[PDB]
Every structure is written in structure tokens, then in C-alpha cells.
């Protein structure tokens, strides 16, 4: 029903290689399918040449594993080989003043190792990608990047916000602005920031944190040229989220709100084989396409995957993301309206600034009417069937149900904060190492027993900005629990993880279609962000 943004024939040929690859290997020896979509064509061969050779090699119906592997190393450069290390111009081993507020000498010295990992995550798109981009699925980019880590060998959209928060702590403002410049280039080329900087991501976006990245950088550097460039591109991205399939209207007892909606109704190329098997239970092609669109839409939500998006959890195949008006998404567009109104006021466009002020107040009242649940003491996703109805609220408990606390008109409301503090301390989401993303152990990675850095930060930051003392103490307690568990994990394995098993201190999290991943961009950023805000006493 919705549009479908086509991918490049390089991507579609690499899916052929991937499908051949995972048929050939034994079941437990299944490789990561993404390492195939991340290949690039080895010079001087062309695509047609490589495809002809592949067609000759595959004229027999599986392929011997050793024959396949020989083809891979002959015609392709490995995954990540077109992504080269880059020494950030603004990196310094120990920055002057870095976490100077952190008394505990052991905590601060660990944090400087964490800060040292910006060098590992720092890399740059090779000159082949810029000169002959048709040979790569890596997209070309104006500036060096910070990647999440490990299998995520490209820059991602919403990761970069919490990365940028850490880069500020690390005093790496040029690297931080380089990420924003890269992301603005994607808005300019495509009209929206891609899920990540790969050709198989041109069909969808991610939670829209661009305006927050520009804001947090401006708030420190007061770079008025960055704001002036950003405004036309943010106006574009705001248009993208409030029109087309992304816009929904909910009439009350009319509010314009947004939903995720990927422009894709096929197996995700990076996971093509897995998605095809996931959908094999549907009998018609329309049912497969609707399911694939909800899978891809869950990818665009950033939370792939969770019982949050399942119509009948924990059944993966009831994934229904396009039916969900999500709390956190509309938190981020409320922020977008506050951010643009600020940047227009600052750049001498008080007329535009008032448009977005009224925008923000309409969404603030959509929040109370549509998402808020007084009896729950939290905000709830609204599931579509249009006009509102109480049973359409998803009453299950998620950390994203508490994301509005991040918003200043919310956390400035002393009475609201108190209702939210109690609802959250009684929710059961608070766990030994931080905040559980949900209460259902589903085997997915965005579910219990896991907790996630971006959700820790939004709640801690929000609670900490209130004037309510119990919120402020709960916020610090969560941050220290998160920091501690990340320290224990780091001492055990020498790395920082994508997500934590917050049910146990010192344990990283797993689940989902791929193995636990390390680096890890927003995890490092939140650790540094929390330490800059709260410090660590030497007596602790
Ligand atoms: Na994600």
C-alpha cells in the first residue's frame, strides 16, 4: 500500500550471494548474513563480470562451501575493508579537564579508557567509495564517522545522539559536528536521515534525534553557521515525519501524531534469509509483504525487536509495528518542535519560531489526551484501528512508556513527576543494573532481561531535571547502577556492550537474530555523559 524505495542492483546481487552462502553452510555454522551485503567489488572487476562468474559457478542444484569462499575472496574486498581507521583530529589521550569532577581515581581512569575507544570507533569512508560508489554498499560521506562497533560497520542515525553526548564530555566537538554534517548530507540527498549510511537503508529512517544533536552542539559551541544550515534540513525532516504514511490523525472525545513506517515490504537485505524464513508461515504474497513492512518498520523504530510491536506477544510473526502510534517517536518530534522553535528564535525568524511553538503545544496536549494514562502513571502507545478509544492503549509496561519525562514542560511539572516516580518504582522495570526495556522475557533483544543505554539516559536526564528530590535521587541511583554494571562487564571482557542484562550486575545482554556486539557507540557515550553529570566520590 505504501511506497517502496528500491535498493541498488549491487545490494540485490549481494543478496543472491548471501542466500547461496547460508544454504551451503551447515546449520550451526550459519554466518552473519550482513557480512555479505557489506562486501564491495574488488577492482578491476565489474558487477556484470562478477555476476556472470557467479551465474556460471551456481549452475548446479547446494554449492560446495570451499568453492563459494574462493569466489568471495576472488571478486570482493571484505566487509569493512572500505571503512578505514581515522585518527580524530580532536582526540587527546587525557583531555585537560576531562571528568575533572570524578573524584574516585579508579572510576576516572576507567572512563579515560572508555574515552580511548573513540579511536577504535573512528573511521572514514575510503576514497573508492567516494570515487566509484556503485562498487560499494557503504554510502559516501563528507566527514569521518563514529560507528556503533563490530557488525555495525557504518554510521547510524539515532545512535549518534548519545555518541555526541559522550564526544562532548570527551571534548571532541569537531568529531561531534562531523557526525551532524554527515547526517545532514543524508537529509539533503534523501529527504530524511537513513537508518544507517548503507544502500540497503535508503528505504527507512530512525528515531529523529538530528535536531537534538544540532542543539546540544550549539548549546556548547554557539556555532551559528551550523544552526543556519540545519534549519532547512530539519524543516525537510519534520515534513517527512508529519505527512504521508508517517502522519496519523486521532480524534478525541483532532490531534496530528506520527508513527514509524518503513518504505519497504520485502526481506531486509542485511537479514534476507532470516526474514524470508520468518515470513514462510504466511500463505499469500500480500500477507508476506505486510509482515515484511512491519519488520522493516520495527527496524526504523530503532527497537528491533520487542513484544512492544507484537499484536500477540511473544509471537514474532504477529509483528505489527505500522499499527502503533508510539510514545517515544512523538517524544522525539515534540523535541523537534522545541528545537526548531529555539533555532528560529536564535536566527532571527520569530515568525517561524511561533509556528513551531504552537506546534509543540498541540503535541503536548495530544500527549495528555492520547498517550497519557492517569491510572497507569505513564504514557502508552496507541494502537490504531480515526478516533480514540481506551482499549486501544497498550497497557504493557515499557521504558519507552516513561520517555516523556525527558521533555522539559513535563519534568518541570512537580506533581506529574511525582505520579511518574511512583508508577516507575512500582512498575518492576527498575532492576539491579538499570531500567529494563520491558517486563517480558521474549528472546528478543529489546525485551527483558535487557536494558539499553538510550533509554537509561532519557529517564535519568528527565528525572534529574525535575525539582522533585525523590526523582533526583532515583535518577542518580539508576545512573550509578548502570555505570557500575558497565564497569564490571568491562573488567571481565575488556569491552563495552551494545546492551546489558540489567537483571544481574556485571552481565551483558543478548537475544535477537545476532550475537552480542561490542564497541559500543551510545553505550560509551551514556557512560561518559552520566559520569560528567554525577561524578564518582573517592569513597565509593
Ligand atoms: Na536498532
Swiss-Prot record:
<dbReference type="GO" id="GO:0004555">
    <property type="term" value="F:alpha,alpha-trehalase activity"/>
</dbReference>
<feature type="binding site">
    <location>
        <position position="268"/>
    </location>
    <ligand>
        <name>alpha,alpha-trehalose</name>
    </ligand>
</feature>
<feature type="binding site">
    <location>
        <position position="159"/>
    </location>
    <ligand>
        <name>alpha,alpha-trehalose</name>
    </ligand>
</feature>
<feature type="active site" description="Proton donor/acceptor">
    <location>
        <position position="498"/>
    </location>
</feature>
<feature type="binding site">
    <location>
        <position position="498"/>
    </location>
    <ligand>
        <name>alpha,alpha-trehalose</name>
    </ligand>
</feature>
<keyword id="KW-0472">Membrane</keyword>
<feature type="binding site">
    <location>
        <position position="270"/>
    </location>
    <ligand>
        <name>alpha,alpha-trehalose</name>
    </ligand>
</feature>
<feature type="binding site">
    <location>
        <position position="195"/>
    </location>
    <ligand>
        <name>alpha,alpha-trehalose</name>
    </ligand>
</feature>
<dbReference type="InterPro" id="IPR008928">
    <property type="entry name" value="6-hairpin_glycosidase_sf"/>
</dbReference>
<keyword id="KW-1133">Transmembrane helix</keyword>
<keyword id="KW-0378">Hydrolase</keyword>
<keyword id="KW-0812">Transmembrane</keyword>
<feature type="binding site">
    <location>
        <position position="206"/>
    </location>
    <ligand>
        <name>alpha,alpha-trehalose</name>
    </ligand>
</feature>
<dbReference type="GO" id="GO:0005886">
    <property type="term" value="C:plasma membrane"/>
</dbReference>
<keyword id="KW-0346">Stress response</keyword>
<keyword id="KW-0963">Cytoplasm</keyword>
<dbReference type="InterPro" id="IPR001661">
    <property type="entry name" value="Glyco_hydro_37"/>
</dbReference>
<feature type="active site" description="Proton donor/acceptor">
    <location>
        <position position="304"/>
    </location>
</feature>
<feature type="binding site">
    <location>
        <position position="151"/>
    </location>
    <ligand>
        <name>alpha,alpha-trehalose</name>
    </ligand>
</feature>
<dbReference type="Pfam" id="PF01204">
    <property type="entry name" value="Trehalase"/>
</dbReference>
<comment type="function">
    <text>Involved in the regulation of trehalose content by hydrolyzing trehalose to glucose. May play a role in the regulation of abscisic acid-induced stomatal closure in response to drought stress.</text>
</comment>
<dbReference type="InterPro" id="IPR012341">
    <property type="entry name" value="6hp_glycosidase-like_sf"/>
</dbReference>
<protein>
    <recommendedName>
        <fullName>Trehalase</fullName>
        <ecNumber>3.2.1.28</ecNumber>
    </recommendedName>
</protein>
<comment type="subunit">
    <text>Forms homodimers.</text>
</comment>
<keyword id="KW-0539">Nucleus</keyword>
<keyword id="KW-0326">Glycosidase</keyword>
<dbReference type="GO" id="GO:0005737">
    <property type="term" value="C:cytoplasm"/>
</dbReference>
<feature type="binding site">
    <location>
        <position position="204"/>
    </location>
    <ligand>
        <name>alpha,alpha-trehalose</name>
    </ligand>
</feature>
<dbReference type="GO" id="GO:0005993">
    <property type="term" value="P:trehalose catabolic process"/>
</dbReference>
<feature type="binding site">
    <location>
        <position position="513"/>
    </location>
    <ligand>
        <name>alpha,alpha-trehalose</name>
    </ligand>
</feature>
<dbReference type="InterPro" id="IPR018232">
    <property type="entry name" value="Glyco_hydro_37_CS"/>
</dbReference>
<comment type="similarity">
    <text>Belongs to the glycosyl hydrolase 37 family.</text>
</comment>
<dbReference type="GO" id="GO:0005634">
    <property type="term" value="C:nucleus"/>
</dbReference>
<keyword id="KW-1003">Cell membrane</keyword>
Amino acid at each position: 500500500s505504501g511506497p517502496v524505495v528500491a535498493t541498488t542492483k549491487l545490494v540485490t546481487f549481494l543478496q543472491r550471494v548471501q542466500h547461496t552462502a547460508l544454504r551451503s553452510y551447515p546449520k550451526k555454522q550459519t554466518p552473519d548474513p550482513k557480512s555479505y551485503i557489506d562486501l564491495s567489488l574488488k577492482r578491476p572487476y565489474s558487477l556484470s563480470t562478477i555476476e556472470s562468474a557467479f551465474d556460471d559457478l551456481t549452475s548446479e542444484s547446494p554449492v560446495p562451501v570451499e568453492t563459494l569462499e574462493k569466489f568471495v575472496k576472488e571478486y570482493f574486498d571484505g566487509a569493512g575493508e572500505d571503512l578505514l581507521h581515522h585518527e580524530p583530529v580532536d582526540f587527546v589521550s587525557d583531555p585537560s579537564g576531562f571528568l575533572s569532577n570524578v573524584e574516585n581515581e579508579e572510576v576516572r581512569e576507567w572512563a579515560r579508557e572508555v574515552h580511548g575507544l573513540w579511536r577504535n570507533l573512528s573511521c572514514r569512508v575510503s576514497d573508492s567509495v567516494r570515487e566509484s560508489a556503485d562498487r560499494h554498499t557503504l554510502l559516501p560521506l563528507p566527514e569521518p564517522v563514529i560507528i556503533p562497533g563490530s557488525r555495525f560497520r557504518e554510521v547510524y542515525y539515532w545512535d549518534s545522539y548519545w555518541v555526541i553526548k559522550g564526544l562532548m564530555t570527551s571534548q571532541m566537538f569537531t568529531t561531534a559536528k562531523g557526525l551532524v554534517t554527515n547526517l545532514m548530507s543524508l537529509v539533503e540527498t534523501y529527504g530524511y536521515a537513513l537508518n544507517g549510511a548503507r544502500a540497503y537503508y535508503t528505504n527507512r529512517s530512525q528515531p529523529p534525534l538530528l535536531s537534538s544533536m544540532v542543539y546540544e552542539i550549539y548549546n556548547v559551541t554557539k556555532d551559528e553557521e551550523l544552526v543556519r544550515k540545519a534549519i532547512p534540513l530539519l524543516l525537510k525532516e519534520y515534513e517527512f515525519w508529519n505527512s504521508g504514511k508517517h502522519k496519523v490523525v486521532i480524534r478525541d472525545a483532532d490531534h496530528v501524531l506520527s508513527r514509524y513506517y518503513a518504505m519497504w515490504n520485502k526481506p531486509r537485505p542485511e537479514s534476507s534469509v532470516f526474514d524470508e524464513e520468518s515470513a514462510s508461515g504466511f500463505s499469500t504474497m500480500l500477507e508476506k509483504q505486510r509482515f515484511h513492512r512491519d519488520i522493516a518498520t520495527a527496524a526504523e523504530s530503532g527497537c528491533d525487536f520487542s513484544t512492544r510491536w507484537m499484536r500477540d506477544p511473544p509471537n514474532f510473526t504477529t509483528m505489527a509495528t505500522t499499527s502503533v502510534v508510539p510514545v517515544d517517536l512523538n517524544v522525539f518530534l515534540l523535541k523537534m518542535e522545541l528545537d526548531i522553535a529555539f533555532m528560529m528564535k536564535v536566527s532571527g525568524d520569530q515568525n517561524g519560531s511561533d509556528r513551531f511553538v504552537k506546534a509543540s503545544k498541540a503535541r503536548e496536549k495530544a500527549f495528555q489526551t492520547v498517550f497519557w494514562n492517569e491510572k497507569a502513571g505513564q504514557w502508552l502507545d496507541y494502537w490504531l484501528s480515526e478516533t480514540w478509544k481506551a482499549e486501544n492503549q497498550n497497557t504493557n509496561v515499557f521504558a519507552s512508556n516513561f520517555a516523556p519525562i525527558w521533555i522539559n514542560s513535563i519534568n518541570s511539572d512537580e506533581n506529574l513527576v511525582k505520579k511518574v516516580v511512583t508508577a516507575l518504582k512500582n512498575s518492576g522495570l527498575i532492576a539491579p543494573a538499570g531500567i529494563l526495556t520491558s517486563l517480558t522475557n521474549s528472546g528478543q533483544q529489546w525485551d527483558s532481561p535487557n536494558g539499553w543505554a538510550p533509554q537509561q539516559e532519557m529517564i535519568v536526564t528527565g528525572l534529574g531535571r525535575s525539582s522533585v528530590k525523590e526523582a533526583k535521587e532515583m535518577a542518580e541511583d539508576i545512573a550509578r547502577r548502570w555505570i557500575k554494571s558497565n564497569y564490571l562487564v568491562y573488567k571481565k571482557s575488556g569491552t563495552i556492550h551494545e546492551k546489558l542484562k540489567v537483571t544481574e550486575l556485571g552481565e551483558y545482554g543478548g537475544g535477537g537474530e545476532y550475537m552480542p556486539q561490542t564497541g559500543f557507540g551510545w553505550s560509551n557515550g551514556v557512560i561518559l555523559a552520566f559520569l560528567e553529570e554525577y561524578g564518582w566520590p573517592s569513597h565509593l
